[PDB]
């Protein structure tokens, strides 16, 4: 029911985002009727699989999923294997390997670690894609943390190739935890979802992965800035509103 779906979405809005997967599991348990509809409207933390063919790690979402088997961008084959799960269009797989390498460079320059994946697919005309980044924290007890990025881009490619209209919905799930002597424990974390629309010049010098990469980079810089300067800043201000060091 629509009203129960709105309630489910609000309840997700209010609950802490550190434990989204437990919350989603129990929420589908409460009303299993709306499992699918809810899963479309909510984003989950990305999961890391190992590709045994190549020996390294790829990311899991609902676009590299056919049935209960997940395709790897690196071997192009599903785990566990499948007789005929849908596979990328012939032109599109080469763009996928290109974009995977490109966003791997992006990932190493900004994150200095973690794993990344890109899965694209044909539309009516033009195409769509997902860019998934998963970085963990290894600093210490004082630096526990996790960053998850899901970028869903749709490129309604105009037939001429002169210009392409790009849409992208970006979503960040992150949480930091500090464990210092002075501040005690601090679990500062949230989720933001912002979307940009823009059509930029496509050329042989600037293909789709160029324009899309610039879009993803700009949006991530903006979301991380907005997270730190507005949300975390506002929570800091609220704390000092609650209590004052200086006597009144």
């Amino acid at each position: 029911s629509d009203q129960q779906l709105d309630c489910a979405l609000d309840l997700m809005r209010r609950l802490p985002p550190q434990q989204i997967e437990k919350n989603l599991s129990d929420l589908i348990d409460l009303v299993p009727s709306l499992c699918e509809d809810l899963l479309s409207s909510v984003d989950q933390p990305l999961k890391i699989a190992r590709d045994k063919v190549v020996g390294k790690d790829y990311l899991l979402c609902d676009y590299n999923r056919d049935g209960d088997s997940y395709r790897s961008p690196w071997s192009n084959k599903y785990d566990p294997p499948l007789e005929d799960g849908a596979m990328p269009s012939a032109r599109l797989r080469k763009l996928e390997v290109e974009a995977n390498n490109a966003f791997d460079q992006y990932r190493d320059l900004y994150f200095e670690g973690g794993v990344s994946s890109v899965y694209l697919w044909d539309l009516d005309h033009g195409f769509a894609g997902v860019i998934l980044i998963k970085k963990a924290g290894d600093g210490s007890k004082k630096i526990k943390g996790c960053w998850d990025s899901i970028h869903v881009v749709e490129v309604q490619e105009k037939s001429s190739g002169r210009t392409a209209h790009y849409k992208l919905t970006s979503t960040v799930m992150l949480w930091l935890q500090t464990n210092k002597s002075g501040s005690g424990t601090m679990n500062l974390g949230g989720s933001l979802t912002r979307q940009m629309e823009k059509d930029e010049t496509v050329s042989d010098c600037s293909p789709h992965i160029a324009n899309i990469g610039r879009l993803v980079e700009d949006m991530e810089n903006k979301i991380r800035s907005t997270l730190n300067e507005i949300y975390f800043g506002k929570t800091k201000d609220i704390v000092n509103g609650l209590r004052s060091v200086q006597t009144f």
Binding site: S225, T226, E229, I230, G233, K234, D237
Partner: protein, 357 residues
């Protein structure tokens, strides 16, 4: 007796007499002490820079070097304004989020060493806003060494929403030096920095669209201007006219981890309560010299409209006089008879104590 207005700028001090339409004297806020002729302050320190060593007491807007700032005020009073401080009341300007200890020490210097008959300290951004004709709005103050986003609702600045950007005209001048030198010219000496600052002020401008104007720079010599040097040798300035102030919107050009002024205005508005944002968006007043690039108001309107809700009405107010509006408003206030009654007289400083201001 007429009063003194002193704008303690990050790079440029602006002093004059109350009621004037423009500062009687403007000079760089540098102190020059022999490296290792006691003291030389202002244009003198620039003149004899080799023998001297440079110090920037207000480089970021907050006074950190009191011994040198006292010299700067001595230069202001005695050498530029040519007046006796004891016989002239003095309005000083305050940086946004100036500490209380800072203002108390400023007051103390004025009363105990310069013996001013009375003095008052006013916030820069609020003076500019008031001079712009409103008491609610968000101010962008971009000077020499600091840029501030200051939201004000009904006369009160909201300190939580105040944003500091450490990029301004100094950095823009240096980046222009760099990109000209990369073009093939040579601007690496201080004398050449002065010339390049003039090139900036007279030939730079903010592009409405950056990528389109890069394309138009490649396409034609339409956006190319010429600047004659003191040598008489003429140089051609190309896209670098607008690539330079573009650093205000993309700090990564000068290699800076920060947001562009549009993004910081947006952040500063969002640090405010939802009820007042409608009034902040529709009252963007710009102040300070680094906001004089032709085409920044339209650029900022475009960018902020992009960052804002569709419904929202955004207005950018760029007064023609903004380069000195801070001082100007101050002058006007200090010219009023009723105003100086509120100022703290010298006699009131000692029995009440330094805590009054």
């Amino acid at each position: 007796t007429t009063a003194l207005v002193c704008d303690n700028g990050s790079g440029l001090v602006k002093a004059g007499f109350a009621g004037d339409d423009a500062p009687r004297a403007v000079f760089p806020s540098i102190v020059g002490r022999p490296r290792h002729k006691d003291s030389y302050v202002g244009d003198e320190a620039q003149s004899k820079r080799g023998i001297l060593t440079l110090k920037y007491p207000i480089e970021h807007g907050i006074i950190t070097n009191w011994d040198d700032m006292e010299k700067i005020w001595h230069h202001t009073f005695y050498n530029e304004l040519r007046v006796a401080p004891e016989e002239h009341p003095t309005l000083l300007t305050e940086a946004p989020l100036n500490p209380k200890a800072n203002r108390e020490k400023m007051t103390q210097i004025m009363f105990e060493t310069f013996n001013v008959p009375a003095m008052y300290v006013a916030i820069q951004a609020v003076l500019s806003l008031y001079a712009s004709g409103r008491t609610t709005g968000i101010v962008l103050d971009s000077g020499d060494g600091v840029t501030h986003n200051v939201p004000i609702y009904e006369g009160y600045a909201l300190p939580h929403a105040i944003m500091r950007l450490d990029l301004a005209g100094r950095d823009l001048t240096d980046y222009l030096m760099k990109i000209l030198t990369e073009r093939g010219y040579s601007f690496v000496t201080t004398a050449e920095r002065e010339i390049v600052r003039d090139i900036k002020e007279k030939l730079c401008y903010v592009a409405l669209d950056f990528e389109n104007e890069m394309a138009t720079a490649a396409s034609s010599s339409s956006l190319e201007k010429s600047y004659e040097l003191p040598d008489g040798q003429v140089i051609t300035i190309g896209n670098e006219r607008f690539r330079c102030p573009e650093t205000l919107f993309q700090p990564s050009f000068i290699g800076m981890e920060s947001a562009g002024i549009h993004e910081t205005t947006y952040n500063s508005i969002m640090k405010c309560d939802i009820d007042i944002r409608k009034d902040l968006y529709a009252n963007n007043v710009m102040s300070g010299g680094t906001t004089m690039y032709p085409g920044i108001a339209d650029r900022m309107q475009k960018e902020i409209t992009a960052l804002a809700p569709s419904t929202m009405k955004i207005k950018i107010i760029a007064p023609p006089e903004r380069k000195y509006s801070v001082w100007i408003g101050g002058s006007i206030l200090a010219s009023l008879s009723t105003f100086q009654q509120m100022w703290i007289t010298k006699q009131e400083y000692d029995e009440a104590g330094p805590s009054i201001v």
